[PDB]
Structure 1
Amino acid sequence: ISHGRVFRRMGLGPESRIHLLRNLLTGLVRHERIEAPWARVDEMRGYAEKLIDYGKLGDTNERAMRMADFWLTEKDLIPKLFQVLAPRYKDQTGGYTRMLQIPNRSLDRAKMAVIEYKGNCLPPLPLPRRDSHLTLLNQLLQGLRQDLRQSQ
């Protein structure tokens, strides 16, 4: 039984899942977009956010240096991280990524999701846009909101 377990069993072991998510990290951080199964991406999101928050400190911190050295196997995306991504999110404190489900994979009919860091360069996704304000109900909302503001 499981009550309060936040992690999920993912591969042939803890080492398996961490190496798996580490490869997903090395893949994601350079393309600043990645498709993958929904569970893997859900786990990946937190690791990515914590990693960028840990790298905000800069390159002088040997802690962050060796941590990113572990978490990234290509060894070339660490400079990219420290000198691009931290400046990109210097103003941002949360919601660094966007994650959205997409149609299932071809063969295994698996549940898939795409994740990408906010403020990327490559084209955007067709995000779910909330209903327009010009609609009937939204305009009624604006109307009685104006009425309440007039009252008070």
Structure 2
Amino acid sequence: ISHGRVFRRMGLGPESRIHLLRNLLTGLVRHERIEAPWARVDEMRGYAEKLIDYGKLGDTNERAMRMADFWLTEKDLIPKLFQVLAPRYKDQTGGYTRMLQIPNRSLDRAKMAVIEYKGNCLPPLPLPRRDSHLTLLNQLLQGLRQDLRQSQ
């Protein structure tokens, strides 16, 4: 019975789970785009968002500095977290990460995903785009919208 359990059981235990997520998140902060097993990316997405929030909190905040020091195993990224990412997302309030499924791993056919910080310098992902407004169905719905607007 796992009603309401929100954390996956990963690695060799709770500490190993935290460390795996920490390594994935350090890689994400360094490269701005990481491909890893789908479940691990899903688990680490929330922590990525939380680091962005802690970076928004600012350098001077000792609590934020401690959190960044713990989570970023490579200490050169803490200046990055606080001076490149948080300023980038100052305008935003959330949704800093884009996660998208990727063709299964060739080795063990694992469900893989790619997670990136939005607005990174890297080439854009082949994002799935909704159907063009000029399609038949969308044009008919546009006609509906125009008719309703005219009625009101």
What TM-score results when the alignment is normalised by the length of structure 2? 0.98
3-state secondary structure, aligned to 1:142: helix
1:67 deviation in Å? 1.0
- Residues 1-152 of structure 1 mapped to structure 2, 5 A cutoff: 1-152=1-152
1:106 deviation in Å? 1.0
**In structure 1, how many angstroms separate the alpha carbons of the residues matched to 2:62 and 2:107?**
44
1:21 deviation in Å? 0.6
1:77-118 CA-partner distances (Å, limit 9, x unpaired) = 000110111110011011111000010111101110000011
1:66 deviation in Å? 1.1
Percent of pairs with identical residues: 100
**In structure 2, how many angstroms separate the alpha carbons of the residues matched to 1:38 and 1:107?**
15
3-state secondary structure, aligned to 1:28: helix
1:22-73 CA-partner distances (Å, limit 9, x unpaired) = 0111111011000000100000100010111122111101111111001111
**In structure 2, how many angstroms separate the alpha carbons of the residues matched to 1:51 and 1:30?**
13
**In structure 1, how many angstroms separate the alpha carbons of the residues matched to 2:97 and 2:58?**
20
Ranges in structure 1 where 5+ consecutive residues have no aligned partner? none
Say how many residue pairs are matched.
152
Ranges in structure 2 where 5+ consecutive residues have no aligned partner? none
What TM-score results when the alignment is normalised by the length of structure 1? 0.98
3-state secondary structure, aligned to 2:57: coil
Runs of 4+ in 1 over 4 A off after TM superposition: none
**In structure 2, how many angstroms separate the alpha carbons of the residues matched to 1:42 and 1:124?**
20
What is the CA RMSD across the aligned residues, in angstroms? 0.7
**In structure 1, how many angstroms separate the alpha carbons of the residues matched to 2:105 and 2:29?**
22
